[PDB]
Design a binder for this molecule. Sequence first.
Ligand SMILES: C[C@@H]1CCO[C@H]2Cn3cc(C(=O)NCc4ccc(F)cc4F)c(=O)c(O)c3C(=O)N12
Ligand SMILES: C[C@@H]1CCO[C@H]2Cn3cc(C(=O)NCc4ccc(F)cc4F)c(=O)c(O)c3C(=O)N12
Ligand SMILES: [Mg+2]
Ligand SMILES: [Mg+2]
Ligand SMILES: [Mg+2]
Ligand SMILES: [Mg+2]
Ligand SMILES: [N+]
Ligand SMILES: [N+]
Ligand SMILES: [Zn+2]
Ligand SMILES: [Zn+2]
Lengths: 368, 368, 181, 181
Amino acid sequence: LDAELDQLLQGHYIKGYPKQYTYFLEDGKVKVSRPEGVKIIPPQSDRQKIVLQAHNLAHTGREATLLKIANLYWWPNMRKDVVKQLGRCQQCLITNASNKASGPILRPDRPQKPFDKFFIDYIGPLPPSQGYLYVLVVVDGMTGFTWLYPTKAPSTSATVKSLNVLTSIAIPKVIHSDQGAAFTSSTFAEWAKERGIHLEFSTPYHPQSHGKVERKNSDIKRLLTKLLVGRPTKWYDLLPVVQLALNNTYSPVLKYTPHQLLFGIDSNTPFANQDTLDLTREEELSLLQEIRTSLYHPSTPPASSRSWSPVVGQLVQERVARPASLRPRWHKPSTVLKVLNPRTVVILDHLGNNRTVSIDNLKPTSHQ
Amino acid sequence: LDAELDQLLQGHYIKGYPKQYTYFLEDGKVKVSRPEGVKIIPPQSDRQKIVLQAHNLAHTGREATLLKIANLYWWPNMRKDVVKQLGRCQQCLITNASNKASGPILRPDRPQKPFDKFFIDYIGPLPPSQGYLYVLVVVDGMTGFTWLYPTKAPSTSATVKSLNVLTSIAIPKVIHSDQGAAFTSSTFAEWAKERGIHLEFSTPYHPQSHGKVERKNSDIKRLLTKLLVGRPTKWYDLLPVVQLALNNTYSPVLKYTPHQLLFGIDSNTPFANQDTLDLTREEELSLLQEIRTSLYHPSTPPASSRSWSPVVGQLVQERVARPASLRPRWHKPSTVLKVLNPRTVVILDHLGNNRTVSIDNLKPTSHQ
Amino acid sequence: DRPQKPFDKFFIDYIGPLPPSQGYLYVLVVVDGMTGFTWLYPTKAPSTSATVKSLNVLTSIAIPKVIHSDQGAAFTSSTFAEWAKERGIHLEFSTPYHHGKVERKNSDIKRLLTKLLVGRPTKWYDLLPVVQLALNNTYSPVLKYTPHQLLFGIDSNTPFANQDTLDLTREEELSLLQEIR
Amino acid sequence: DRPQKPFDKFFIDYIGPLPPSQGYLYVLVVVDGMTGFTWLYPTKAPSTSATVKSLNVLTSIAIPKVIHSDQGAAFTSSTFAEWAKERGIHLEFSTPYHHGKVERKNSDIKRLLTKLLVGRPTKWYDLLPVVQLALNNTYSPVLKYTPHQLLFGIDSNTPFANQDTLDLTREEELSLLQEIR
DNA sequence: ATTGTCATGGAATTTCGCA
DNA sequence: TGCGAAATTCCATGACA
DNA sequence: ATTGTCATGGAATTTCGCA
DNA sequence: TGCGAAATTCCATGACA
Ligand SMILES: C[C@@H]1CCO[C@H]2Cn3cc(C(=O)NCc4ccc(F)cc4F)c(=O)c(O)c3C(=O)N12
Ligand SMILES: C[C@@H]1CCO[C@H]2Cn3cc(C(=O)NCc4ccc(F)cc4F)c(=O)c(O)c3C(=O)N12
Ligand SMILES: [Mg+2]
Ligand SMILES: [Mg+2]
Ligand SMILES: [Mg+2]
Ligand SMILES: [Mg+2]
Ligand SMILES: [N+]
Ligand SMILES: [N+]
Ligand SMILES: [Zn+2]
Ligand SMILES: [Zn+2]
């Protein structure tokens, strides 16, 4: 208003307007001679509109917005008004990228026993082989021991069929997976209750959460690729070979094959390890229990220099999963209800549903 | 052969076989009592076959291969024989990932004048807007000043039509682009010769090489997205607005808009900069020439701890561009003929054609 | 002489014909000698082919040094001999027409099967998984451990702590004498 | 009073009817006052619509403070007035029926056009790009610089160092007197 | 027989206003 | 000749098929 | 109302063979 | 009690939709 700017012209002091500068009327506008030139001081009541006009030219951030305004104007604490509008521009908020990295990954404890936790997932679709297009991959958490099932679809039914065959051997406490339609259906839920099996799901669109199986997927494809070099991609008959071959391969860091971690002795496969020939089975299972508990466990890495960790009550935004062309990559702001661990949170989404979500699919909303 | 292993049994010394160890016959096989247990020393003539059998179980690398062999065998310098076979396994060579990073990026000099170099590329396809699906993007190298042309296809013809309109203003020395069909056709080549324009092409599948335009693509899509929030994706009528808006936005690092770098004075657009009001045009163009030459230039970053730089005569492999499912991601080994710069090389491909190729699409072949 | 181990010896046999179930008639029985761990495979016939097909599944998990069987045609065929030689498996036959851990296990299987196929002689295909879990989490009086425990070195998450009757009830003996009618 | 600048004032006019070329008949002429830099736009009619459509292209590169024109209908329509007001452009008209840098430039354009449309009165659409390059890389005797040089502060990569005849030859005067027949 | 780029918004660092 | 606060500059982060 | 993983192959570091 | 060379361990890199 003209209130503030009146005292200024008649040479009195107002907080924020430095006193060593000549303020004058001209063309109907309060002005000021600043080092860079003469700028108009607009009335406080005009400022928001100005910041907005400048911002809206190209929906620019702090500096690019200020540089436009500073061309014609000066007032005290300009960036504060800029940041105020940046924080209220829905369009910028949901479209701009983040420039803060996620905090460092958790390395959760290896499951203590075989059959404590299975990780499962589908690979595919693959070139048709005998009418089959997908592979069900099942990785035992503790041992890494893997089972492979060719399927025609990534369906609950084909999942149930394969697991009936597997669970003939042993029943797991937990089965962990992503939110594929196969694993989240109610038919599959009932199948697990029926057997005292607990279904665990990764936070959505975060395959790191079940990285064990994703990672075994790589080796499965890599060995299949080598075996299929210079031949047609008839992979179905090779699944058995790949399973056996991978289950009996050393992890250089662990010094054991997954077969060894599961059974504590090699079966009749080439280069079987003979070190326990003179022990009894019971002395063997005793050495196995010790071996199992002293396996190398990786430590959580250092944070990157510009990471963010969630705090309860923070405004954060979830990544749009499958964004259409020319549409924002971020949902509208939502509040952190609970910090489950430093990499996982429950948010209230503005509908508002409770969602449990990986920090990797989140950005902290900018400008508070 | 039995030659070497004979002297050994009768207690004489052979280079590589340590003398402090008891070597004996048993079951028809030379053996040895090593700390970890008793291992068979196979005859030198059997070793290659053994290394191969062990490797072929799951086409494993150095350690995982050795751990299998060491289960039954010992001989001198085992890993040397392992590495020898790893280097000869075509399948592993063309399928395995690299674990050496590319050397640090070049930051080549900004073109000295406007119109010295144009970078061009297509965005699309986009949601249909007035029958249009693509955008031709043209970025002036020195200024960043950009021109946008809606097209129906990413064709040579639509390219020629748009550029005829642009080159009405000024003709560039160079036009730089990727190897899209539009830019590599002979119709387009003739169109450039006809005008004394030199066509420059990025090494294949390396959009960093013309990062200026790729990067302007991001801003073009980002502003289009914001403008289209909550409306249908009618982008055609917005191209003009986006062009003008982007050409008149400050780069915070440069402190100038691209319009300013091109013309040295703002046109009648909001928040026009008035600093040169009292200069003559000629004093303005003098300040512009000085401003143009003192623009911030980024320095080449530090190398990552495990990078590789090409050397003439090195075996290297080119990344397969669009690899089919279950097929190797790498071509067969090829030789570096010339190191153009530390990030670019000419290779002889085994056909053998000369190819000029980004180091980012190369891995150094392992095991020499 | 070295102590006995899992994978040392697999004992195979066929059981059937049974009543058709999802089109299957037989059961290939595999018992590991050391652990008494059992694996079952439904087949359509007691043939070399059905045997090879079923053992391929098993031998992609674990390969036995020795397979032991009677002199069934399936097992003495030269096809099956080739199959075994390819995998470095030694074949071993008991003399024609002629007690132990294995022998008792096969008894349990026949008995346990017979018990559960009463009133449902057709639903055995779906019960094979549970038959195996039962068998493999059954306490052995000789050793203090179940086959699960000896194969994996851990307790299981399905202990069958009910040592089940395994005997035919009064209603079921009358059901079996009426099934044959 | 502040020195003259590019974008200070754009001078617009129509030239035509011309012979049809790709279905176009007129040329909207835009000359920047300070630099003499010329822009040309082919149109189908001398209408407010064709003007707005053409100037939208130009005004997405650079917006003039003032547009100067004669009192053509296209330019004095209230549609065109609205268009200009939306962009903060001031409109300016010369009095009806009534020398300078601009005036000479328009002469060159008419003359240069006439020269090149002989023997090819239909191919002018494709020549507009080169007409402009020629005009804009033409040396000005008053200032020591071409319009290119004054707009961009650099030499161009197409200097038309041949100050061209611009006059009609003997074969072409006879061609123009036979074109009207 | 060629080559990454730059808006972005917290944090680090500098400059300003005043004494 | 040094303080508190504002302004400016730094620069990791991500994204352009 | 949950969580990255691990084969790979040069380089760094340790151990071995011998004195 | 220390050398040269081999063996082992370290660990950045990339890849699993
Ligand atoms: C059919 C033509 C011929 C050959 O290549 C294809 C595929 N392609 C791919 C990208 C791309 O991957 N952009 C993402 C990106 C990645 C890294 C980076 F540093 C900068 C970046 F913009 C393009 O931009 C692009 O224009 C093309 C294209 O035109 N083609
Ligand atoms: C339709 C279901 C429901 C939800 O998600 C989609 C998409 N998806 C995506 C990936 C994926 O992006 N893998 C690459 C990867 C990336 C990062 C990392 F650390 C590890 C990785 F393996 C999968 O693996 C996967 O299984 C799925 C899938 O099943 N679905
Ligand atoms: Mg999945
Ligand atoms: Mg997956
Ligand atoms: Mg392209
Ligand atoms: Mg591109
Ligand atoms: N954990
Ligand atoms: N350069
Ligand atoms: Zn905005
Ligand atoms: Zn290999």
